[model samples]
Target: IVGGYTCAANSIPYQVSLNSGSHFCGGSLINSQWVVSAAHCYKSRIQVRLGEHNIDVLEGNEQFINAAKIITHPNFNGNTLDNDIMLIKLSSPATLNSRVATVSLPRSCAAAGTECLISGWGNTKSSGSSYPSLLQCLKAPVLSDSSCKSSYPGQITGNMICVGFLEGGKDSCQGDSGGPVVCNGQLQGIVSWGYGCAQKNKPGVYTKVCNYVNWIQQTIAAN
Candidate 1:
């Protein structure tokens, strides 16, 4: 994450690393057996690591589990990046503790300008430079849909929410896809896409978690 700092150990317990030998994406543990991530991060084989503060270190608090199933949003569009959310069922339930827990789902959309927290193990620079071992985090405010649309004309959709500074210097970049954007102690967004990392007027766009609450609940209930 651009313009961010290393997170305190296990401070963001719900955060998980989506790995296939190495960290490729970030996800949130919403329950013992389910994770919320971006649809675009899907792979044939995925390993979910919970309670991980630093990817390079083997922290005893971490729990590595396999993905038993993955369900991408049916209406997800790769070209436009709409409805970019996905769910992953764990092969076994996670053992929750102070260092491994679940994040609550949002009941409603986050209002424009609401300050939120975004954390991930993505790049720390805009040029795709510096992949941090420790999870990075930064504070960003949600931009209005109209303003976000103006920034990326014809690209922003209702299912997406933009968060970051219009002046630049703070964003979720590559390797951070599917990470959590937390607001009011709830999961409000998922890191999905952006024009360029921390570029002026190019805020990081996320899957509006509020829009997919029903779909997530229904899917989890059925499966």
Candidate 2:
């Protein structure tokens, strides 16, 4: 902002927590009643919390809503993690305010080497430490498709993009999936999966948001 520090409260109004019985993953508010997350984060009766910085507290700036419907990408491949994006329709539209809004999706993919920031409450590391209560933000550089494909052959599909360092450290980990990877103030990617948290030569892989623009637009319009 893996080596990330606590984020400024309400700095990302669209960032949201996707939960069932408890907090499990991060997401982004795409509209007044729609949230975008990873398909793998889905389950029955999930909850979406918008504008929440501290997961433990009910700050006045927060807005909680129950999911009315969950629409996972039909082509999502759970095993290979291809097309891992999902949409959550809130039971009711959020009460938009100063601390709650939506993020703009990218018209195209972020160029390689672009600097981007990811936010979540995921673990500090892969094996140690529990998820943080307050939101965490980290900065990472987007890797080219060729570089990402080289690192994870037969795994990095066209729908995926990688971010972070090949040497090691600074990445999104567990509980971070579906969170926004913002580049130049536009939504670039959605945290999907990786080999591990902040590991050497193992950058965090994400659902390339640009590749799904038409799909998202159609899904939202149809819903």
Candidate 3:
């Protein structure tokens, strides 16, 4: 998160750390056996770390599970980041506890101007990058599609949404991809991409979760 601070321990139980041997991206545990993340964050192989608060330390509550299957959206466009979403099937179901839980998915899109919270163990600075041991949190308001389009110009699509401000402040940065953006206590978006961290007029973009809800449900059911 850009201009963010350390998050409270176990505050977001569904938050996930996607490790391709090492930490590469953030994700969310949407169900006991399934995780939702950005297709751009996908690696050849991955391990999903659940109930994690701090990335540097292993807590008793943590469940380190290998991914049985990693499925990126068939239509995902890597170059333009269109339909940038994915689903990972866990080798086994997570043991739900106080420190581990599933996040609720949005039934519809969150309205523009809805304040949402995004958390991750990604970089702290835009220019200088370093992963924090503890998770960081940032509050970003949903930007209208029109406003977002003006900033992005021909790049913004219906499958995407923008958050943060154009004033060069708080936003998600490198390594935060695939993390959850919670609005009204529902999973509204995933950290997808941006121009260059928290630069002016370049708000962070995300994969609009509501637009792919059907695919998500079908994928989970089929798997």
Best by lDDT: 1
Candidate 2 clashes between residue pairs 3 or more apart in a chain or in different chains: 1-138, 2-170, 2-171
Q: Candidate 2's residue-wise lDDT over 1-223, tens digit each? A: 2688888898888899987777899998888979999998878788898879888988778877999989999999988989999999999999887678888999778999999989998888656877788999988889999889888988988899998888876889888988999998888889999987788878899999998889989999998
- Runs of candidate 2 exceeding 4 Å displacement: none
Candidate rank order under lDDT: 1, 3, 2
Tens-digit lDDT track of model 1 for 86-152: 9999999999999999999997899998989999999898764999889999888999999899999
RMSD of 3: 0.9
lDDT of 3 by residue, 120-140 (tens): 988898878877888899988
lDDT of 2: 0.88
Clashes of each: 0, 3, 1
| RMSD after CA superposition, every candidate | 0.8, 1.2, 0.9
**Error in Å for residue 31 of model 3:** 0.8
